[PDB]
Nucleic acid binder design. Structure first.
Length: 343
RNA sequence: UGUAGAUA
């Protein structure tokens, strides 16, 4: 029940209350929205002895506060301003409960804060991460857990993350189309060794055609194009070749086509552009179609920018007579600019 | 002129 002290504070009877005055009341106040903000505020100016006073009390109820809508911020504040002995002690209260905390709306914030606050080489940390072993996919798919998984990947030594990689075996296609899975996969590509990512990249190439057209998978494919090895980039480009026109008019895949134009080799880029500028499959010209498309106009712009003089000139000549046309379409109103300030 | 996740 709400003690007099808290009632009084909430009624503004203590307009300049000091942290020291909360001895015995820290845990109660931490679970109150206003008491919690008060403690957060005072911790930023508190002396070390004053922080320790607050620490002693919060430590005793650490798990409870970690899963509290208002107390979890007080816990986080010590990961922010506490000394390492204090952080390690709090981490110890996370240990043994990593899974339920990871899936919990407030608990998951505390875990991420610990991961950012405590040196990865500290046993505690290692122990915490290992508790996710056997639950990786459940966390990846959880609205709270997925951020914990990402933060582990961002913060911990990649060798220790082999179980996460193994967990993804045969699941890379499905999870790259997942709102959180795609983010986790991108973190993996960023942080794990080329050794670890090899099987991940393999499964990505297996399903490139599908992933480039997916609302989330298109981002994973773009990541590889922007950050991956040349040989992986060339694999993605080869999947795009022969499909430029179609993919360029696609809300998601248009973006991948752009990154292909930017990040391919001079020679690969030329072949892609050639598919737009210099081929004749049927009556309607590809360039003409792409020019005034809501999405493909962006691809045409990237091609004009990245093209060697010869191809650039052909594109310009082919657009030239269609000025009046590009006029009516919202989407040609950047292509026309480049046309004018090229002629 | 065009797409990405859980707290007071």
């Amino acid at each position: 029940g709400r003690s007099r002290l808290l009632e009084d504070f909430r009624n503004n009877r203590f307009p300049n209350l000091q942290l020291r005055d909360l001895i015995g009341h820290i845990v109660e106040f931490s679970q109150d929205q206003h008491g919690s903000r008060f403690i957060q505020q005072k911790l930023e100016r508190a002396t070390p002895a004053e922080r320790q006073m607050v620490f002693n009390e919060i430590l005793q109820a650490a798990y409870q506060l970690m899963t509290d809508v208002f107390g979890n911020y007080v816990i986080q504040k010590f990961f922010e301003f506490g000394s390492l002995d204090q952080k390690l002690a709090l981490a110890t209260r996370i240990r043994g409960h990593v899974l339920p905390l990871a899936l919990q709306m407030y608990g998951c914030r505390v875990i991420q804060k610990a991961l950012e606050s405590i040196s990865s080489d500290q046993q505690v940390i290692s122990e915490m991460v290992k508790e996710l072993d056997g639950h990786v996919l459940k966390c990846v798919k959880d609205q709270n857990g997925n951020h914990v998984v990402q933060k582990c990947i961002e913060c911990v030594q990649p060798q220790s993350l082999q179980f996460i990689i193994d967990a993804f075996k045969g699941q890379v296609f499905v999870l790259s189309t997942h709102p959180y899975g795609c983010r986790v996969i991108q973190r993996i590509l960023e942080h794990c060794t080329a050794e670890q990512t090899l099987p991940i990249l393999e499964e990505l190439h297996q399903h490139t055609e599908q992933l480039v057209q997916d609302q989330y998978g298109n981002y994973v494919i773009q990541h590889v194009l922007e950050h991956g090895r040349p040989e992986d980039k060339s694999k993605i480009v080869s999947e795009i070749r022969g499909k430029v026109l179609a993919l360029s008019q696609h809300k998601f895949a248009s973006n991948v086509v752009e990154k292909c134009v930017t990040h391919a080799s001079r020679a690969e880029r030329a072949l892609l552009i050639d598919e737009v500028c210099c081929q004749n499959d049927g009556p309607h010209s590809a360039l003409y179609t792409m020019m005034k498309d809501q999405y493909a106009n962006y691809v045409v712009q990237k091609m004009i920018d990245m093209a060697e003089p010869a191809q650039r000139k052909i594109i310009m000549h082919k657009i030239r007579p269609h000025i009046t046309t590009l006029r009516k379409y919202t989407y040609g109103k950047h292509i026309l600019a480049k046309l004018e300030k090229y002629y």
